[PDB]
Design a protein around this ligand. Sequence first.
Ligand SMILES: Cc1cc2nc3c(=O)[nH]c(=O)nc-3n(C[C@H](O)[C@H](O)[C@H](O)COP(=O)(O)O)c2cc1C
Ligand SMILES: Cc1cc2nc3c(=O)[nH]c(=O)nc-3n(C[C@H](O)[C@H](O)[C@H](O)COP(=O)(O)O)c2cc1C
Lengths: 140, 140
Amino acid sequence: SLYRLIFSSQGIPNLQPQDLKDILESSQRNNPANGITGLLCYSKPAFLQVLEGECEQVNETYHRIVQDERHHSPQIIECMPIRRRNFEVWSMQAITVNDLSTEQVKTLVLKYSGFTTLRPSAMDPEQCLNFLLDIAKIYE
Amino acid sequence: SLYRLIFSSQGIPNLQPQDLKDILESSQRNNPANGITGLLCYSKPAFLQVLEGECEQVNETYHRIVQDERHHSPQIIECMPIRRRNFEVWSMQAITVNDLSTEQVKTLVLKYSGFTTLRPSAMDPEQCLNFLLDIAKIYE
Ligand SMILES: Cc1cc2nc3c(=O)[nH]c(=O)nc-3n(C[C@H](O)[C@H](O)[C@H](O)COP(=O)(O)O)c2cc1C
Ligand SMILES: Cc1cc2nc3c(=O)[nH]c(=O)nc-3n(C[C@H](O)[C@H](O)[C@H](O)COP(=O)(O)O)c2cc1C
């Protein structure tokens, strides 16, 4: 009943600043409640993110996520029953990747991937989550 | 880059043999090119799909299956990269299970479940793997 879901996506080519905080209000009004927790990451245009919570919640959310007019082509990287939550999960939070490339952050991309750019496309699930973890560290 | 995805959904109140013949002619047609192979399985109401391939046309197919309406509310029990394929024989293989099924199949259902009717959300990843495994193991 306690799952972890990983997957990445592609943000519609015309997405604006005022759209993402609206993705936030959502994640911060729709998750805490659901014992949905974890971390969402943006690197124009690449998306990554892990979900953790009740299996049925994890799912209730992901499939609700997929129809959003705001991006296309989502790749589940992992969905698996887990032993314990990793993010103490103050919230399903969001980080924009700058890109801004870089100050100690580009490094985190030769490490878990190759080039300086966020291609969740090279990542294996472990290098996938390993990364979502390392970034949050140096950040609150 | 290989990956395996296992999921189960709820059929609509009225799927007929005619309505079951239609999901398959679409996966021995699409999936061959699509590169999709696996067992599907159907004990009214639920289907219980296993799908095998690389990460892209997996999601491609699934997210498409979920766009389907013949069922509703899919759930991912497990997605992640594998060693080797287990369902390579059929580009898909439908297999109806029902209380009318042979007294044999009825008991393979019981070997992994707490009740005699196929119930996915009460079965862990291993249980479904082997069920589907042992159940294709015995279907030409
Ligand atoms: C990358 C991305 C991640 C999102 N994550 C969530 C989420 O975790 N929870 C959520 O409720 N909405 C999330 N959304 C937004 C939903 O698609 C949608 O806005 C939300 O379900 C609407 O909720 P509302 O009924 O409160 O307005 C996300 C959107 C994007 C683009
Ligand atoms: C439970 C279930 C599983 C399905 N699995 C597949 C599948 O593996 N591959 C596929 O192409 N269609 C699958 N479908 C049906 C697709 O939603 C749809 O029939 C297909 O994308 C249409 O293909 P067509 O345009 O060639 O007719 C499934 C449908 C259901 C209800």
